[model samples]
Target chain A: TRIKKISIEGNIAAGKSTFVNILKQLSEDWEVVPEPVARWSNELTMEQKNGGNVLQMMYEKPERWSFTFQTYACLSRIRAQLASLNGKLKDAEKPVLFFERSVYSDRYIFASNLYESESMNETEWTIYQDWHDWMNNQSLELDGIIYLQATPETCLHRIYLRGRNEEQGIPLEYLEKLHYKHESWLLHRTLKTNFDYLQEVPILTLDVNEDFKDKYESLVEKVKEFLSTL
Target chain B: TRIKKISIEGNIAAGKSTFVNILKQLSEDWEVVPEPVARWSNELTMEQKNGGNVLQMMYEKPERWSFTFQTYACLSRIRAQLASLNGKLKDAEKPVLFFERSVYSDRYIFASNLYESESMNETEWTIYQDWHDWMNNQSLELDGIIYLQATPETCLHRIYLRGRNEEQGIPLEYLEKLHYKHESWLLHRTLKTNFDYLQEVPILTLDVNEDFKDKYESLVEKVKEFLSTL
Candidate 1:
C-alpha cells in the first residue's frame, strides 16, 4: 500500500516522544522516524566531533549557528522522513511513516522562529529557504500534523525533568516563542511557507497542557479518529 | 549556492566505483553519494538478517525477489540522493551532489529488465512504478547523467577480474541484456518512463570499452569539462 506519512508535531518537551511511542503500538502498520539528534550531535555518523554538535552550538549562540544548524537539521530530518519511502514493500497491508517531529517543524516552527528573531540574517534566511524550497516546493506528502498543543510553561517543566544537557538552559521565553510558531503553523493555520503543501497542511491538535496519563484512552481515540479521517 | 546533482551512471562492472572515487577529487565542491550496498545488504542498519541481502537474493531469485528488491533499491537510492540535499551549508562556492549510479538506474535499467523478463509480473511492475512515480514524477534535478558506456563483453571481463561473489555466476548474456537497457534508456533514449523528467534527462556518454588506466588524464579532463558545461 502507498504509506501515509504523519508528523507528531509540537513545541519542545510537549510530550511528542511519549505520544509517538504510545501511538506506534496502536498499529503494526506504522514505522517511527525518531529524532535524529544523534546525527546532529555526530554520534550517529561520527563524521565530525563535537564539531557536528550543531544543536548545542545553535542553542548556545543562535545568531552564529542558526543557518548552519537549521540547514543540517532540515537535511537530517528529510533523510528520516523519506527513508520510509521503501519500508515494507506493498502487498498485504497499508503503512504509515510516523515521525517524532517533521521537517516542517524544522522549517516552519524552529527555523521560522530563528529567522523572525533575527538570529538568521536575510542572506542566511534566504539560503535556508532554498534548501526547504528544493525539498518541498513541489510537494509535502504529509497525511497530517498531530499537533500536541501544550503551554510553554508545561513544556518548560517537562524540559527540566528530562534534563537533556543541550536543552537544560533553554528559557521558558524561548519555548514560549516556539509555542507561538507551533500554534501559528498548525492549529491556527496562520504560518505561511513557500511550499503550498505546508502552507495548508492538515492539522489535528491534541491538547496536553497536563499529563496524558489521565487521558491515554481519549488520546488514542483522538489519534485514531484523526488518522481515520485522513 | 544551489547544489547541482549529477549521477555517475553505467552498466554493472562499467568502472563506476573507480571512476566515482577518482572524480571526487576533481573539485573540493563535489560531495559523493556512495553506493548504499551496506543498507541493501542490511549491514548498514542490521535491520534484517541475510533477509536484507537484497542484492544477492534479487540476483539469485529474480522471479521472487524482483519487486521487493526493485522497490527497496529505489527507496535506498532515494535516501542516498536526497541525503545529500543538506550536505554543505549554503556558502561561498558551488556544490555538486555526485552520485554513484542513481535511482533511475534502479528503476529504468534493472527494474525494467526484470519486468521485461517477466521476473516481475504486471502487478508487481505497476507497484514498482508507483514507488518510482511518487519519488520522481514532478522533478528529478540531475544537472546531467554521466553515462559510462561500455560493452557487455568488456563488462564481463571486468566483472571476472573484480570477482565479487555475487558477480561470479552472472553470465555475459545477463550483462548484455542490462547493456541493452542502459543503452536504450540512456544512449538511444528509447526507454520510456512515467516521470517526465526522466524521459529526457540530459546524457553525456563516455565510452569505456577498455581500461581507462592509460587515459586517466583525459578521463579527468573529460569529466571536468562536462561539469564545467553544466
Candidate 2:
C-alpha cells in the first residue's frame, strides 16, 4: 500500500542533484523532486543581486526570523512531501520517486550550523532537540538510499564547476569539512542505521565522485531489479 | 568555533530517557538535556485523563504551539549550547553535554504527523512545510546523532513489557508504520542530508536489535572512539 520512496544524499557537489536527474532520466516513470532548498537559494540569489550577502538582511531584520537562511528550504520540502503524498508530484504513475535533497535535513542542518557556528546553551539544546526529534520523524515512505560518495577534491571541483556567484564565498575548508560530515554521516550514520525505521528498505551506497558514463544506467537497473521482485 | 552537541532520537519506549541516564552515569560531568515535548505530552496525558486525545491541543492552541513546541525548543537548546561553551554542562573536568533530542527532529516530526494525519491538500501542505522548515533552520548546533535502531515489534514489546498505562492504547500497526517511516526517512531522506549542512560531525549509529548486552557497550564505545578522535 505504501508508495515507493527513494532518497538521494551526499555532500555539496557530490552529485546529489545529478543522481536525482540520472534516476529521472533512467527511469521511464519515476519523477524527480528537485531540492526545495535550491528553490529558496535561487530566489535568495536573485535577492542578493538587489541587496548583498543575505546576512545583511538578517542583521537588518533580526526580528523577522521568517525569511532567514533555510527558512525557505524547510518550508519548500514540507510542501513537496505533502504534494507527493497528495498525488500532486508529476508522473503519478511513477511509484518510485526521487528527491535531490531532503526536507528533514533542513532542521538538522539549521540546528547544527547555527549552534555550531553561532552558539547556544544546555537548556536550549534540550528543548531544541526534543522539538527536532518530533519534526525529523516526519517523512514519506522510503525504500532505497543512494549516497553519492566523493572526495574533497571532487566536491571542490564540482562546486567550482557549477560557479554560482552567490555561492562564491563558501570556503574550501568549510566544504572539505562538510564533505567529511556528509560522507561519514550519510554512510556511517544515516544509511547504516536507516533500517531502524525502514526495516524493509534496502540501501545502496554510490561513489558519485567517480565519473560514470553509465552510472545512471546502473542505478536504474538496480532499482528495476529491486522493483520487479516487489 | 563550533560547539560540540549531541542528539538522541527514538520512537516512544525506545529507551531514549533511560539511555540518557546511562550517558549520565558514565559521564557525570555531562549535562543531560530533557525532552521538551514531554512537558506538552505530559500535560496532554493529564488532560486525556478526562476524555479523547488531547494531543491535538498542541496544534489547537497557538500559544502552546509557540511556547511548548517552538519557543521552548529554540530557547532550551540555545541555553544548553551556550552553557556548554561557558563550561556549565562540564564539571571540573568539562563533561560532554548530551541532549535528549534535537528540535531538528522534533520540528519536522510534529509538522509531518500533524500535516500527514490531517491530510492537508497540496497548497495547505506547502504552507505547513514552509512554516516548520523556516522555524527549524533557525536553531543552533548538533555535533552527534544517536539514531536508536530496532524493530517495531521490539519497540511495542518493550512498551508492553514496561506495562505503563499511558502507553497502553498505542496501536501496533501505527507504531510499526511510524517506526518504518521514521527510520526510512532518517536514513534515506532527511537527517543524513541535514547533517551535511553542518559540514561534518561525529555520528554513531546503534542497531539496538543486536546483542542486548553488547548493544549499549558497543554504541558507547563507537561514540567515545569517534568523539575522542574528534
Candidate 3:
C-alpha cells in the first residue's frame, strides 16, 4: 500500500494554501503538511537572535547569504517532507500526504528565480541543483501536483493586497520571470530533466486569474475529481 | 593570479593537523584555513541551546539526525572554503590556500562512512553525493593534496592517545570501514568521477604509522620538495 504524496505548487498568492485547506476538509484520510514557512520564519528569528535576518539579508545583501540561506531552504524542505512521512505507515489504510511547494518547485521555481536573476551565482545555483536532484531521486513517488496557475499580473495584485514586509522588495519583474519559468516547466514542460521524469505525477492546473474567493465550490469539485484517481 | 588550493586528507588522528602546521611553517605565501570542526561544533552548541544535541544524537540515534547534520556539514564546508576565498584575491603574489579537508574528502570519506554504516539513508547519501559533485565542479582547482596515510590500528592508537570524550564510543570497526573507503578513493583511486578530474591535483602520500613526532626534518624536507613543484 504505497502512500499518495500530492504537492501544491503555484506562484505567490496563487491559492495554494486555500486549495490545501479545501483538500484538508475533503477527507479525514488526508494528512496535510503545511509549507515550511514557520520553519523558515523560526530560522530567521533564530538568526535574528544572533543579529542576522536571513531573508532581509538575502534581499539587501544577497552575495553574503543567498547561497547559505537557499542551501538550508532546500535541506529544510526535504526534512519537512521526510519528517511528515515518519510513523504514518501504521494506518494500513492508504493515506494521502499533501505538501505545499515540494523539493521540485523549490529547485524549478524559487531557486530558478534566484539563479536567473543573478541573486544566486553559478556556484550557488549548481550546488542547489545537485542537492535537489540527488534528494529528489530518493524521494517517494509524487501522486500529483495542484498547480494553481496564475499570471504575473494576478499574482502581483494578490501579493500587493496581502502586503508582507519582506515581499515588498519583490519586483513585478521578478514575479514575471518566475511566472515564465513556472509556465515553461509546468505548462510547456520545457525543463524536462526534472519534470519529465515525474510524468506520472498528474498536474491539475487551476487558472485562478478570476476571483475564487467567494466561489471555491467549483474549484474544490475539480480537486475532488482529481484526487479520486490517485 | 589563480589561488592554489591544497587539501589535507587522512583517517582519524592521521596527523592532518600536524601536516597542516608543517605546511604553514614552510611558506608565508600559504594561507592555511583550519577545519570547520569549530563551525560544526558551534552549530551543535547552537542546537543544544534549542534542546538538540546533533553530534550526540547522531552518535546515539543516527536515524533522526544523520541526513540533517550531514547536509549542513557539506554546506558549511563549502561555506567555509568560499568564505576563505573572499577578499584574499587582492594579493599580487599568488598565495596558496591550504585547507584541512576539501569538499572531496568530506563526501568521499566521512559521508561515505556514514552512508555505508547505515547511519545515513539512501536519500542522505545521494543528496550529499550530488551536492558534492556539483560544488566540486564549481570550486577552485586544487594544486595538490597531502594524503597522510595510516592504518586503522594506527589511527585508533592515536585516537585513544588523544582521548577525546566524543570519540570514546567510536569502535575500531568504524575506523576500519573509514580506512577502507579512504584507501579505495585516495590511494587506489577507485572513485574516478571525483579524483580522475582532479588528476592535475598532485597527491603526496605519507606513511604516518612510523613516528614523525621527535624527528621531523626528513618529513619536512619531503613536504618542502613536494611544495616546490606546486
Which is the leading candidate under DockQ? 2
Give the winner by TM-score: 1 or 3. Answer: 3
True contacts kept of 3: 0.00
> Residue B166 of model 2: what lDDT?
64
Kindly list the per-residue Cα lDDT of model 2 for residues A1-230, writing each as its tens digit: 34677777777777777667666765566777777555444434332332233344444442322223344344446556667666744544656777665643454444455545544332333434544454454356566666667887788788788887656666778677666556555655652422266444565676666676464667556667766654
Ordered from best to worst lDDT, the candidate numbers read 1, 3, 2
Per-residue accuracy of model 2 over B1-230 as CA lDDT, tens digit each: 33456777777767777677777788655567766445444443321231122234444553323322343444444444455557654333545667777755554554455455553333333443445345444435666677777778878888887786666777787677667666755555543433455335445667776535335786778767866765
The residue-level lDDT of candidate 2 at B24 comes to: 77
Model 3, global lDDT: 0.69
Q: In candidate 1, what are the lDDT values of residues A28-117, reduced to their tens digit?
A: 777677777533432234313322555556667888667656655565566556656664525527677778887777877877888899
lDDT of 1: 0.71
The predicted structure with the larger DockQ, 2 or 3, is 2
Q: Which pairs clash in the backbone of model 3?
A: none
Report residue A159 deviation for candidate 3 (angstroms).
1.2
- The interface root-mean-square deviation of each model, in the order shown, is 19.3, 11.1, 13.2
True contacts kept of each: 0.00, 0.08, 0.00
| Descending-TM-score candidate ranking | 3, 1, 2
